[PDB]
Amino acid sequence: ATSDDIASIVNKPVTIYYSIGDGMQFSQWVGYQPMMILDQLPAPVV
């Protein structure tokens, strides 16, 4: 785009998704780090 058409593009969202493909190999077992529980997160109280 040029300078005139780029004004309609400001603050517009772009999302990026990804899969893992194929021929995709993980090759060394490492245990998991400390996790965090999600429904223990605080709620946005009013």
Place this chain on the structure above:
Amino acid sequence: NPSYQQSPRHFVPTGMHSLALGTNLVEPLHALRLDAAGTTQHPVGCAPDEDMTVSSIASRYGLIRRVQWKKDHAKGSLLLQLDADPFVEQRIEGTNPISLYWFAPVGVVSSMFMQWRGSLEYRFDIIASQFHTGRLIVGYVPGLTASLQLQMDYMKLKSSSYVVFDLQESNSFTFEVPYVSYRPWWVRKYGGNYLPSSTDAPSTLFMYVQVPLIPMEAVSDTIDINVYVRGGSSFEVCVPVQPSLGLNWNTDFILRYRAKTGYAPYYAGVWHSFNNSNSLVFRWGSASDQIAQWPTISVPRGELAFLRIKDGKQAAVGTQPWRTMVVWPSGHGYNIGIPTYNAERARQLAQHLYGGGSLTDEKAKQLFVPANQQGPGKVSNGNPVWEVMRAPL
């Protein structure tokens, strides 16, 4: 060149392929490679050794518990009670406002899935010499509610399935947990921050002291017991959902006055619909009517309000940082933000407007900042917070 005169095809268009399916289809892509038949290789020593397999992850023991078993523990004292599920926790005593937890690998790989079933295997490694002598029950009661977690001893435990272990010369064993439920699978313990989806265990595991410890006078009087968890040979999980666990790489949570979302960063510029371009108003862009929009402050009769930015370093900048403003309806269906030179002017403009005045009044116009103060028209640092300054009117 003959003419094809038969009837053509008659489809339905859609804009995207299967965003969820991943097994038995051939997904077409614009591969950013050079060869269309080219794939990735693994020659010959950089080959995969560990297959990505849930039955290979859940078959690995993870240390979840340590229990002190002492000499003065009486006959039948409780060592541990826990839940017959992969979701067994070990809390880290950290100073963060959100606490981290250790899990078994079966629990981490079961957090991603909604439903689980099968046997669990608890490995008890009792660190003792061949001169310590003791005896304990690892029992297992089918489904108990929260009010039945108490009223528990070693005698009610022996009504259900239980295993009594003697400690003479072999200091380790493995209790395989039965899977007893009214349901073939079992819905997981935590939800994806949806608190009305909490579900407790199918059943409860206990470990009491059947015969107390008799140590010799040359050895210690306390014994450590490690409890390891892995999902057994019949353990399996099915339905993928949002996982109830998160990483600790970015351990930062944000609890829920500023511009409406998207209308920042903003700068103080001019607008033909605000005093005929003669005065500064916050804009989120340079194009047609890209005017920043602002929330309505709740103001009761008998009060006023104006805004003072909490951190001036984050303010939009003209000939000065714009640290104070009044927010008022634009006449075009949203509120605009009108910077002032200082708090005194802002208070005087708010007095005028909440007092019944209009933006087109000469008294209001003289309190605006003139267009020639726009200067560089620098934008704010993101969407910074302003303090709502309230006063009686």
Place this chain on the structure above:
Amino acid sequence: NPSYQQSPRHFVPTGMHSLALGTNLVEPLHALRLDAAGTTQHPVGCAPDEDMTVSSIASRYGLIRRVQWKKDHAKGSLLLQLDADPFVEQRIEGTNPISLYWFAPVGVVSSMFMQWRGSLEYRFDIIASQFHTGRLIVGYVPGLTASLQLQMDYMKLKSSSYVVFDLQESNSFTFEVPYVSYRPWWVRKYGGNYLPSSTDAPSTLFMYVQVPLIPMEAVSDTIDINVYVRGGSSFEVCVPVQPSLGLNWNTDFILRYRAKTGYAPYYAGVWHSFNNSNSLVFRWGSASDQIAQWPTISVPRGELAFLRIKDGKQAAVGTQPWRTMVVWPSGHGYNIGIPTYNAERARQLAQHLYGGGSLTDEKAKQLFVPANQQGPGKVSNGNPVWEVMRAPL
């Protein structure tokens, strides 16, 4: 899940299938049935007996002519002359402004097609006893123009092909008409109301009286002759066009001042671009600038014009039927219709405007109908006709 990385297809889109082709294609549809393999059936007595076939329609005799053949008809008097085509007419003596016609089925099925060729078969049924004696020629002259339709007798007929029939005991015969032309097919007689497409017959059929009638004194002196037409065994038609015949189900034709087409029904409402919404103007809708548009009346210098609706019952209605108006440029590229209370006001407004005034003049504004007379804002009955009222100015 492998990745498809080959090159895809490269079409051309069109929005509709073959609107004209109908034989050797498979037209895809959204069938409003339940079964995709389901079609319609005919079990077993509601089966088709008549195939839709042009050679089965044209093989059916249709009565086209009755001819009185009398005793006092002299030797060689003309009974009928007609055209060697399927387009032979029998006019009904009705009182309608458009006249209906009887046709043979070969003529009806040939009206739909552009070109025809082949033999025609004229069945002559001579209603007589076995005591009437006569003799007549059914002749056939190859191509004659309109100026050669006259200068015709029974003697010039015998130069061409002709058949002489005796009437003693067999009172019916069938003359098969030759097809003689410079052209393999033959373009039909009438067009689809395109008068420069008229074409006369390939040739002309006659029927004179070779020997006059000798009836006995106990029988009648007049004899009816029926003439039936069907397309023969070699008759055929090819190219489908717009058929030159219409049904008599709705025998109603419309011969070509009102609103421009589409800008009706209209009601008298208000518009920000006509006296700042203070006065009534005809609108064809309630949305942005849906203002009715009106033709320019041809008005010479020294005259005025205004409009008076022919039937007040068809008028738009506010606090009254709006039966009178003035039409004037809006300033926006079309003429608007401005209702008035009565003809006197309309004449006074037209005087002002055709006299050199403007819609923004106070004198004009005071002749408009005020907005508070909009009332229910009822629309006109369709697009009714107004009388153009003219006067010297």
Place this chain on the structure above:
Amino acid sequence: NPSYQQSPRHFVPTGMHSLALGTNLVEPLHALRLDAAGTTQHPVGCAPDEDMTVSSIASRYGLIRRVQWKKDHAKGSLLLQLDADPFVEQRIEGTNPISLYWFAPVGVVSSMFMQWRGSLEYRFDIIASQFHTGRLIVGYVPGLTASLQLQMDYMKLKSSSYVVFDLQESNSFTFEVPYVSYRPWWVRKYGGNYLPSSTDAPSTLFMYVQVPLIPMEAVSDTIDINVYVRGGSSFEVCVPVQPSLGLNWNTDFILRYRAKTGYAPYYAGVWHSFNNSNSLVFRWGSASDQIAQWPTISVPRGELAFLRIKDGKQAAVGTQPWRTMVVWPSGHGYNIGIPTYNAERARQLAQHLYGGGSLTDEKAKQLFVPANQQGPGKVSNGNPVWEVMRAPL
């Protein structure tokens, strides 16, 4: 990499598949599963036992009638007359404004289909001892109109098909109903609330008393008779239409002044096209010209009208609930709603406007609510009803 230079395909696009077809096609979808070849299973005890089959639903008896047959019923007294159709009703004596009905399963499964044909089976279970003795006709008259529903006895019944049943020791029988019509199928009794689609039965079933009841002095003098309906072995339905029956889960019907549909909820805000943003007007959104639109009240010359909300709790809220307003043309092709502080002001504004005034008059402007009363700009509760307040003017 060769270049494909042949001619490509030439389709027609449509946006949706077969919304009605369901049998012999393969409908492509975006299945929200993980495996593309995966379907649903039934192992092995949760298998289907009842096939969804209309001939399996209509083969089930449903109790539709109870009939008291007494001792004092004379020879030939009518017990029941009903319609030879699956649409036989049993009304519940409820207090709802719309009445519920019991149907046979054949009637429920035939309500969904337009046309039915075949035999019906009426099971008569006569609850009696082996000491009651009686005899009755279950007759069947081919097609009767409404005026022939009367003039009926047991003697005209015996002209048509009929069955005489004796009651000595077997207390139950089954009458199979013939299907006699001029039409192979039969259009159902009720339409989808289209009252010009009503059609009565093909024929009429009766049940008279051939021999009256003789009970012994030790048993009762009244006998219950149950009448069960199921569609017989030849019953079938074909064309699916909108079903003429509804569930009783939500037994709530709504009989047909408020904002035009869609223009609610609304709040009182400002608009540059209404007194230059200085006064409150109802808006259905915060964006460009999202102004609520209101119906035109029918008002005769010599009257005024304004609006007063029926329930103030449902009103839009600024510094107060906006319970009163005047509706007037905006000048932009629709009516706007202008709140006032109270009914007195509304009456004074309506007086001004219906009296010939304009929204731009100072007298009108002073009766509007000023912009500084917008407050929180809370929306109405849905689209609430206002009372039309009328007065002489």
Place this chain on the structure above:
Amino acid sequence: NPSYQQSPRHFVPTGMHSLALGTNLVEPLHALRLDAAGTTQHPVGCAPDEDMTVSSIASRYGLIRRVQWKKDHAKGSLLLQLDADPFVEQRIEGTNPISLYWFAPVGVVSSMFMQWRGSLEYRFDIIASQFHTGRLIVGYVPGLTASLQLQMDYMKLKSSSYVVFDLQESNSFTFEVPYVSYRPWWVRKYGGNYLPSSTDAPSTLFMYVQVPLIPMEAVSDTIDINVYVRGGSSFEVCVPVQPSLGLNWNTDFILRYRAKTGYAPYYAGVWHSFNNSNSLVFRWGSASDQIAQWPTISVPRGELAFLRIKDGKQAAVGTQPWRTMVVWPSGHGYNIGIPTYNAERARQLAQHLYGGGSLTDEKAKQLFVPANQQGPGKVSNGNPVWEVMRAPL
């Protein structure tokens, strides 16, 4: 004509084919030929002789170095040190601000690719008679950093791989370079002008003097040595990236006040939003609001600025070249350029505006150029540079 009633296809659309893939697909095109099966030919003497092959390009020797080896060079003096990579440079001593370089063909064909590996072959041609006698090491040290490029002699060289060559009668040899790295490939030396992608050699080649030169008194005392490079039989490159080298066909580089990009060429015309079309303002087109936009000059309190074009021949032209202007906010979200008759007027207009004035002031209006000076309305020559004229105010 049967009806196709099955379900149709269900695609995903994309607008362009594989822009990167080039080997194993069939790319469809609109070939601008006449025959769809026609390709290009090579009969029969205009056939290809050189296949486009990277192993055929890198197998060609390119002269990269000349080295003077003299008589007075002591035992162990360094002749050359260089990098064991295809990226070996020979700088041309030109007067251009950007310097050109000679490369081997292996280096040019390796500049286009990211990663290389394999053996290199350095051909040393020692131009001497059969009466010169000398001896030198061509050594090769595995990976050295920049701080280990020094501290190098002929004695540390003999710890690594090295080759000692005697010069008696054969005056040429070829040293094949080993490929020793921690990585199978090797990332190239230069990036596509991304300076944080620089990487030095895998290893370093040296050439010292093992035995100094003994020439006879009838021959010269200096000897030229040519160093040729080609990629050996095991050399190969894989991943294509942006090539780090450019041609010398257009050896012109542009180092980074004028109109914002795209808003030129411009001419001085009129605009309804600038003094009601009465004064000249720069426009980049003749259509709706095609007004040239200009950057904001950084101006501190106490100063002004205006513009004076550097080359008047490049100016827009009306009744004169428009060589001077003032830039000011338009009131529509961007700055406009307002030409003046001369610098004095521009300075007076800037004084007025930076002094607190407005474009709508009479004092400003009288300093604009009137519309009747538009003349031919000729556009500027491209987007020319203006000098920013600053003064105290």
Place this chain on the structure above:
Amino acid sequence: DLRYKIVFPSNVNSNIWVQHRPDRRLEGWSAAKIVNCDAVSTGQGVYNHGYASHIQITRVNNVIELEVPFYNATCYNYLQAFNASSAASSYAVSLGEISVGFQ
């Protein structure tokens, strides 16, 4: 399984996501309806990660055609107007819970 075809308005252009969450138990026949999400307190309003999702491009076509699979851990589910007695019976009314959101 079930098959859902959702038709969106026309003049909108924005890209639409649809998730299926088979986690939401159905609590009573009340609030078994289309619910306008008005606030985000829990993880209900947010587009979550691991669920079966699909994004429809309104610029190409403003209708989505999807198949909701059977994911309950039961033999059957109830097929009447549901009356909530226990907590486990709430897991076995609907297949899941479809959330449609705009970007």
